[PDB]
Amino acid sequence: GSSGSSGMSSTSPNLQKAIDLASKAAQEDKAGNYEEALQLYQHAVQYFLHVVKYEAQGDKAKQSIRAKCTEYLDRAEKLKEYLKNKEKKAQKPVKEGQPSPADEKGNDSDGSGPSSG
């Protein structure tokens, strides 16, 4: 009886890559690699989407993948805030846009004004 080795549905190349990518990202993070984990975390999603775009599978699959895209996307967002925190201090913007209050008060009332005078 020749075993009919056959079950796991033949997955697409784009999807497979997305999985491996995402997996690698984590492995790096734990190891201590954030800069590398970030990139991967991004790619994984990029591919995942492409699949659900045209090479999709089913309403059930779409969500299954999407859920991962959001998760990985959020995780990466953080690695960025950390990578920049250590990265060489970022110079401050000059003449970009300073905050200011609304049209100065209107009514006028008697009062004091303690200031350098």
Curated annotation (Swiss-Prot):
Ubiquitously expressed. Changing A22D: Reduces HIV-1 release 10-fold. Residues 84-111 are annotated as: Disordered. The modification Phosphoserine is found at S100, S109. Belongs to the AAA ATPase family. Proposed to be monomeric or homodimeric in nucleotide-free form and to oligomerize upon binding to ATP to form two stacked hexameric or heptameric rings with a central pore through which ESCRT-III substrates are translocated in an ATP-dependent manner. In vitro, associates on the inside of a helical tubular structure formed by a CHMP2A-CHMP3 polymer. Interacts with CHMP1A, CHMP1B, CHMP2A, CHMP4B and CHMP6. Interacts with VPS4A; the interaction suggests a heteromeric assembly with VPS4A. Interacts with VTA1. The MIT domain serves as an adapter for ESCRT-III proteins. It forms an asymmetric three-helix bundle that binds amphipathic MIM (MIT interacting motif) helices along the groove between MIT helices 2 and 3 present in a subset of ESCRT-III proteins thus establishing the canonical MIM-MIT interaction. In an extended conformation along the groove between helices 1 and 3, also binds to a type-2 MIT interacting motif (MIM2). This is Vacuolar protein sorting-associated protein 4B. The lineage of its organism: Eukaryota, Metazoa, Chordata, Craniata, Vertebrata. The chain holds residues 1 to 104 of 444 of the full protein.
